[PDB]
Amino acid sequence: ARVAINGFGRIGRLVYRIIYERKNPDIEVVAINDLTDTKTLAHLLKYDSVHKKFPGKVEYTENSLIVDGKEIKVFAEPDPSKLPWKDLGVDFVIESTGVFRNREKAELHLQAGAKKVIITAPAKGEDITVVIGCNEDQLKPEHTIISCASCTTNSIAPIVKVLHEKFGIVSGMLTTVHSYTNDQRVLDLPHKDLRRARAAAVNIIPTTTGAAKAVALVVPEVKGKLDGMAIRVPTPDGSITDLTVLVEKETTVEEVNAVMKEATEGRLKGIIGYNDEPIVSSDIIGTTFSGIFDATITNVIGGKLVKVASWYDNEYGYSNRVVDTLELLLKM
Amino acid sequence: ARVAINGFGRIGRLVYRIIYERKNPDIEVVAINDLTDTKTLAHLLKYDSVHKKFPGKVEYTENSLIVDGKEIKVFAEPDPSKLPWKDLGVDFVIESTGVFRNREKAELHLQAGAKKVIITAPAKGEDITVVIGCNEDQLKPEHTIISCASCTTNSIAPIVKVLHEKFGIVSGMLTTVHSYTNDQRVLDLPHKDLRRARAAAVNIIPTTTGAAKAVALVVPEVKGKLDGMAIRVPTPDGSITDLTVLVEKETTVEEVNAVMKEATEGRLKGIIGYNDEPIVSSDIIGTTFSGIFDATITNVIGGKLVKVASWYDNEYGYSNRVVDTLELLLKM
Amino acid sequence: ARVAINGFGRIGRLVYRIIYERKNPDIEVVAINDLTDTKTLAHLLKYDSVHKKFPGKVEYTENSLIVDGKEIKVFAEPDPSKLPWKDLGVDFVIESTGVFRNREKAELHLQAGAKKVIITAPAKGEDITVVIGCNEDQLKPEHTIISCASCTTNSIAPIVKVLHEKFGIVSGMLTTVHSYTNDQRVLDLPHKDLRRARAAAVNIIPTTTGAAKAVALVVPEVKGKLDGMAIRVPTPDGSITDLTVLVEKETTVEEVNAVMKEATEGRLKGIIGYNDEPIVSSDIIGTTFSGIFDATITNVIGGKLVKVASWYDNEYGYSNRVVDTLELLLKM
Amino acid sequence: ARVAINGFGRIGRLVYRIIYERKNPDIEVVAINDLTDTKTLAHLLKYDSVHKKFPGKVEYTENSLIVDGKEIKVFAEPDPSKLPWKDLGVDFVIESTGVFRNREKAELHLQAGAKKVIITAPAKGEDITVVIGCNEDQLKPEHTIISCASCTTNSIAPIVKVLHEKFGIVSGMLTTVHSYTNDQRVLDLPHKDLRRARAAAVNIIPTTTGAAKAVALVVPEVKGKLDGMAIRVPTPDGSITDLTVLVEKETTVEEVNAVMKEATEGRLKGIIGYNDEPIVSSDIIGTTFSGIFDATITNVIGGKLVKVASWYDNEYGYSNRVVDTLELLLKM
Ligand SMILES: NC(=O)c1ccc[n+]([C@@H]2O[C@H](COP(=O)([O-])OP(=O)(O)OC[C@H]3O[C@@H](n4cnc5c(N)ncnc54)[C@H](O)[C@@H]3O)[C@@H](O)[C@H]2O)c1
Ligand SMILES: NC(=O)c1ccc[n+]([C@@H]2O[C@H](COP(=O)([O-])OP(=O)(O)OC[C@H]3O[C@@H](n4cnc5c(N)ncnc54)[C@H](O)[C@@H]3O)[C@@H](O)[C@H]2O)c1
Numbered sequence A, B, C, D: 001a002r003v004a005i006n007g008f009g010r011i012g013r014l015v016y017r018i019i020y021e022r023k024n025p026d027i028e029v030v031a032i033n034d035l036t037d038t039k040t041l042a043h044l045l046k047y048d049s050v051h052k053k054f055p056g057k058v059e060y061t062e063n064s065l066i067v068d069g070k071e072i073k074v075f076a077e078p079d080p081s082k083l084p085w086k087d088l089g090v091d092f093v094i095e096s097t098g099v100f101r102n103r104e105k106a107e108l109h110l111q112a113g114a115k116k117v118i119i120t121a122p123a124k125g126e127d128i129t130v131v132i133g134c135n136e137d138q139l140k141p142e143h144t145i146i147s148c149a150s151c152t153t154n155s156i157a158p159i160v161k162v163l164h165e166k167f168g169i170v171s172g173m174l175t176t177v178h179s180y181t182n183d184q185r186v187l188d189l190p191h192k193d194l195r196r197a198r199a200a201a202v203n204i205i206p207t208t209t210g211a212a213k214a215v216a217l218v219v220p221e222v223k224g225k226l227d228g229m230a231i232r233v234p235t236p237d238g239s240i241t242d243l244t245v246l247v248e249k250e251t252t253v254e255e256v257n258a259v260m261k262e263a264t265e266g267r268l269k270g271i272i273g274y275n276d277e278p279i280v281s282s283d284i285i286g287t288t289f290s291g292i293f294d295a296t297i298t299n300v301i302g303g304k305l306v307k308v309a310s311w312y313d314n315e316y317g318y319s320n321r322v323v324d325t326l327e328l329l330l331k332m
C-alpha cells in the first residue's frame, strides 16, 4: 500500500518515524505534503526537541526527502484537491494538518485520487471513529473517512469500557492535565479560545478536550453520562487523565486495580499499560500505549465514587494507534 | 501586640509584607528568626521573583533589619526554645519554618516566652485549626497553638460548606493543580516522597495535599466523605482546586453558580471571590482571596454529579488569611 | 494629535497602555487595527501574562473598544492601504505588526492618509532610525518614516556611544541572552530561521539580533567594529546584553563604572539606569529604562578588553521609547 | 579495581550508569555512599527526568543495591573518614558530593583506606587537575588527589589550547549560558550567592563559573589572559560556552573552523566534536563529548577578535570524562 501524509507536523512526523521503525513491507510512504520546503522538513524530521534524533539518514533534494536511500516526494500544496494522489497511486492518506477534519474537506483526498483517509483527530461526518481497545471490530472495508479520535479519548475510552462492564457507570467526569501543543501561543496572542490565547509555558490553562464527547462514540453505553475538560500546563509532552466516576456496584481500590491488571494482560494488552510505581510525566515519554493505568492513584469513597488515572504520551502513544489503524486497513 | 515571625521564607516574608501594608497600629513585628544573615534576609525581602519589589525601604545592620526606619531584631536560632521571646515581650509567634508543626515543637515558643503561636500549615495536636469562612467563631482566648490549615484547604473548605448546606454532600473528591513550592527539587534529588523528588519545572507530579483531611476538620459534617490529591506542575505560583461532589438534591449549573454568587456577596465576602471570565493562573497572582470560584467551569451531570473549581494564589491568598487570624487574636 | 496603532500585539498593546498612563492631552488614539475581533482585543488588553491587569475599565462594541468611556474604532484590515486614515484624521501611526518594515510597506499608511509612521523594529528604507540617547537630535520635521530600531539596540547603543567617547572602541561583540517572543514556536514548527523553529520554552536557542547592524546607524563612529548574536532562552520577558569590547585606552573596572554612573545621572538620565545590587531578570520587569547598566558584571582584562552588561525589559522598556519618540514628533 | 562512589547525585548516578554501559572488566563498583536509603537510591537510579530509564534491572535490600544480580553495598555516612574503604578494598573513590573539594576533606577517603580520589569539581590542594585533551599526559602514578575540573572548563579548555597554539591568545572572556543545577533553588531561598538564591526556573541568573580560573591550570600558557562568568537559565540540562578572544595572528572564520575541524578529527577526536547544522540545546543531550565546536557561530572582526562557541551536556559529557580519567589510573 502506498501511503501519503498530509501535514508533517508533530503527529505527521512521529507517524512517519513509527512507520519507518516498524519496517512493514506492505506500507510505503510515497509522498509528504506541507506548507514548507524540503530543507525545513528534513531538519525537523532529523532533530526533535522531545523525542531525540531520527534513527535514519535523512537527505533532501529540491523536491523530495531521501531517508536511507528511499526518495519521498514532497509537496507544499495547501489545497488537498490539487494533490497528485491518483497519479502517484496513493492508497491511504494520513490527514494530520488539523484543518481538514470535516468530511467535505477530507473527501478532497479521495477526489484527488486516494482510497481511504485517516484523520488524526476528532472528525465531523466521518464514516467511523475507531479507538483500538473499544471498537476496532466495527471498521469495515466500506469506511473511507476514518477518525482515530483524540489522544485523551484513547487514554481513557478503553478504561471507561472495562469499568462500565464491571461496575456499571452512572455518572462521570474527567479532567486531563495535558502538555501544551502547537495550537496554543508562545505569548498572549489572538485565538478563538481566550484561554488558549495565553502564554503556554507561563500558565495553568483550563480549556476543552476532545474526549468529552468522543468517548460516548466508542463506548455508546456511556452516552450522556460523562463530561470533561482539560487543563493545559507548562510541559512540552506527557499528560494524565484524572477520571472520577459514580459506579453502580460497590467496589474497592483492590478490586478496581485487579480488574484493570487483568485487562492489561488480556484484551487491553499493549494498549493500556499497568503501573504501580511512583512515576512522573517525564517517565512515560516515548511509550507506545494509548494509556498507562496508574494503580497508585486509584481511590474509592463510599464504595461507589471512584477515581482512576491514566498517563499518556499525547504525541507518541497516539501516533502508534494511528499506525495500528493503518495496519488494520491492510486487512481488507 | 508584639509579633515574631519564625521562618522568613515564602510565607513568612509575604506575611510581613501584608502586615506592613495593612499598617495596623496594634501589631508590631519585633523579631524575625531564620537560619541566615541579615544581608540575605534583607535582599530576599526586597526582591521577589513572583511578587515584585517590597514597597518600603529596607536596610540592615549586623543584627537587624531596618524597614522604613524601624529596627527588627534578626536571629539565626534553629532551636525555638533558645529564642528571647520572654525578654522581647513577644506576644504572638508566626510559625512558618515548616518543621515545627507538632504541638510539642510549637510549644517551645511559649516556653521561650510567647503567648500564642500560629502555625502556617496543617498541625499535629493543635488547639484548633481555623479556616476563615468555615469556623473562625470557634476560636477562644484559651487557644494558644493555632493552625491555619493549608492553602488548598482555604481554597475549597468555604465552598464545600455552602454546597453541603444547600445540596447535601454525599461523596466527593478534589484534585488540586498546584504550582511547585520549596518542598520540591530543582533536579531529581532524595526526598521522602519519591514523586516530589523529581525535577519540579520539568514534570507533572502527582503527590499529596493537606486539604484531603483538613476540610473535614473545619466542616465536620463532611468527615469521611471527601478525599483528594495534588498534581504539582511547572508554575512558580498560582493553583486551582477541581472538586467533584455527588450531591443529594438535584441541581443545575445555573443554580450552583447563583448560590455561590450570593455567598461571595454575603458571608463569604472577601474570602471567596466570584469569576465568570476566561482567566488563567497568571491573572490571579496577587489576589487576597482564599479562593476565587470560577463560574465558567461549573458543571452538573445527571442533576447530581457536580464539578466546581476554585483558583488561588497559594502564597498570597493564604498569607492574607494568616494575618486575618492574627487580627482575630487582637480581639481577646 | 490623532494616533492609530497598527498591530495590537505585545508592543502595540504596551505602547497603548503607556500612552494611557501618561495622560498626555495632545495625544488621542483614535483607531486600532489588527486581525481579530473586539472581544478578543478587549480581553487581551485587559489581562496580561507578564504585565498584569490593565488599570482602566475596558468594554467593547461590535466595532470599537471603549476604555474609560472613550471610544477607539477597531479594524481588521490586513492591507494598510485600505485603512481610513484620511477620514479618521490620523496624523501618526505606530506600525507594530512586524510585517511592514520596508519603506514600500510603511508608505501604504501615508497613501491611506496618515502623516508620519513609526515602525517599532529595524526597517529598510526608513528616513531615520532614532535611538533616544544616541541621535534623537537628528530627528527633523521632514522625517516621515521613522524607526525606533530594536530593543537590543536600545539597551546597548547609548552605552556604546559613551564608552567609545571615553576610551575609544577598536572592536567588539555583543551577545544578548533574550527572552522568547511571538516570532518563535511552542513546539518544533517550520520557520525561516531553523533554530527559531524549535520549542521556545525548552531550548537554549542561538539566533539573530537586530542590534548587530543597527548600533552603527545611531553611533556611526563604531561602524564596522561591532557584531553580535542572540541566545533566546525559556523566559517570557527580560533580557541582558553582554558586550565584550576592545578599547583604545587603558582602563579599570572602577573607571568604566564611574564613567557610566556619571552618564546615567546626566545625559542618559531615565534612558540608561545604573545598578549595583545582585538582581536577576524578574527584577527588571516593569522598568521604563532602555537598559540598566549592571556595575556588578563590569570586567577588564589586559586593561583593554572590557565587558559590560545591560538588563532590559524587552517589551516595556522599548515601548516607553516608542512613546517618547511619539512625544518628540509633537514638538514639530 | 574496586571503586566506590561518594555522592550518588546527578554526577554520581551518571558516572555509574556509564561505568555500567562500558562493561570494563577491570572496574568493580563495590560501594555507594549518600545520605538517604536504598529504596530512594534505587528509584533515583532507575528513573531520570533528563536521561531516561536505566537499561538494567535494579533491586534493593535494606543495605545494598542489586543491579543485574550484582550487589553494591550502600552507606549513609556523612563523614568519609568513617567509611570502610580499607575493609571493602577500595582502590579509587569518585568524590561527587560537591562538599569535599579541598585536600583536607578529600584525604579522609585515603585515611579511610582508599588509594586514590577523583573529585568531580574544581578543588583546592589537589595534586593535579586533569582535563583530557589538555594535560592528561601530566598524570603521574604518584598523583593521589585528582580533579577533573568543571564541565565548563572541559567544554572550552581543549579549544583554548588549539587556538592559542595556532593564533596565539592575548586576552579573552567566556560566558557560559548554562542549564540550572541542584546548587540552585526552586523559589527564592537563602544561598551564599544572592543570585543563585533566586527561583531557578523563572530567571536569567548571572553567577560564577569554575572555568574562569581552571582553564589556566590545564593551559598554563594562557594564565592571566582569560576570565569568565555564567548565566544560568531555565533549562534542566545542556549548556553553551561563548568565547570571545583577542588573538595575535590575523585570521578569518574559515581558517578558525578549518583549524578546529582538523583538531576534532585527530588529537581531540572523541573529546571535542564538530558541528555545522543549526542545532539547539535539546539536540546535544546524551552526547559523550566534552564540548561540541559550533562552526555556525564562529565570527571574526578586525581579523583578530574571534568568537567561538562550544555546546555540551554538562552532566553527561562531563561524567564520561570522569570515567575516562578513572580508566587512565587503570594503566598505572
Ligand atoms: N500534538 C498532540 O498531542 C496531538 C495528539 C493527537 C492528535 N493531534 C491532532 O493531529 C493534528 C495535527 O496536530 P499537531 O500537534 O501535529 O500539529 P502541528 O501544528 O505541529 O502540525 C500541523 C502541520 O500541518 C501543516 N499544515 C497546516 N495546514 C496545512 C495545509 N493546509 N496543508 C498541508 N499542510 C498543512 C503545518 O505546516 C504543520 O507542519 C491536529 O488535528 C491535532 O489536534 C495532536
Ligand atoms: N508556599 C506555599 O504555597 C505555602 C502556602 C501555605 C502554607 N505553606 C506552609 O508554610 C510553611 C513555610 O513554607 P514556605 O513555602 O514558606 O517555605 P520556605 O522553605 O520558603 O521557608 C522556610 C523558611 O524557614 C527557614 N527555616 C527552616 N528551618 C528553620 C528553623 N529550624 N528555624 C528557623 N528558621 C528555619 C528556612 O531558612 C526558610 O527561609 C510550610 O509548612 C508550608 O507548608 C506554604
Ligand SMILES: NC(=O)c1ccc[n+]([C@@H]2O[C@H](COP(=O)([O-])OP(=O)(O)OC[C@H]3O[C@@H](n4cnc5c(N)ncnc54)[C@H](O)[C@@H]3O)[C@@H](O)[C@H]2O)c1
Residues within 6 Å of the ligand: A189, A190, C006, C007, C008, C009, C010, C011, C012, C033, C034, C035, C036, C077, C078, C079, C096, C097, C098, C099, C120, C121, C150, C151, C181, C182, C183, C314, C315, C318
Ligand atoms: N516583543 C518584543 O520584545 C519586541 C521588542 C521590540 C520590538 N518588537 C517588534 O515589534 C513588532 C511586533 O512585535 P510583537 O512582539 O508585539 O509581536 P506579536 O506577534 O505579538 O504582535 C503582532 C500583532 O500584529 C497583528 N498583525 C499581524 N499582521 C497584521 C496585519 N497584516 N495587519 C494588522 N495587524 C496585523 C497580529 O495579530 C498581532 O496581534 C515586531 O516587528 C517586533 O520585531 C518586539
Ligand SMILES: NC(=O)c1ccc[n+]([C@@H]2O[C@H](COP(=O)([O-])OP(=O)(O)OC[C@H]3O[C@@H](n4cnc5c(N)ncnc54)[C@H](O)[C@@H]3O)[C@@H](O)[C@H]2O)c1
Residues within 6 Å of the ligand: B189, B190, D006, D007, D008, D009, D010, D011, D012, D033, D034, D035, D036, D077, D078, D079, D096, D097, D098, D099, D120, D121, D150, D151, D181, D182, D183, D314, D315, D318
Ligand atoms: N551537575 C552538573 O552539571 C555538574 C557537572 C560537573 C560537575 N559537577 C559537580 O559534581 C558535584 C555533584 O554535583 P551534582 O550536580 O551531582 O549535585 P547533587 O546535589 O545532585 O548531588 C550531590 C549528592 O551527594 C549527596 N551528599 C551530600 N552530602 C553528602 C555527604 N556528606 N556524604 C555523602 N553524600 C552526600 C547528596 O545527597 C546528593 O545526592 C558538585 O561538586 C558539582 O559542582 C556538577
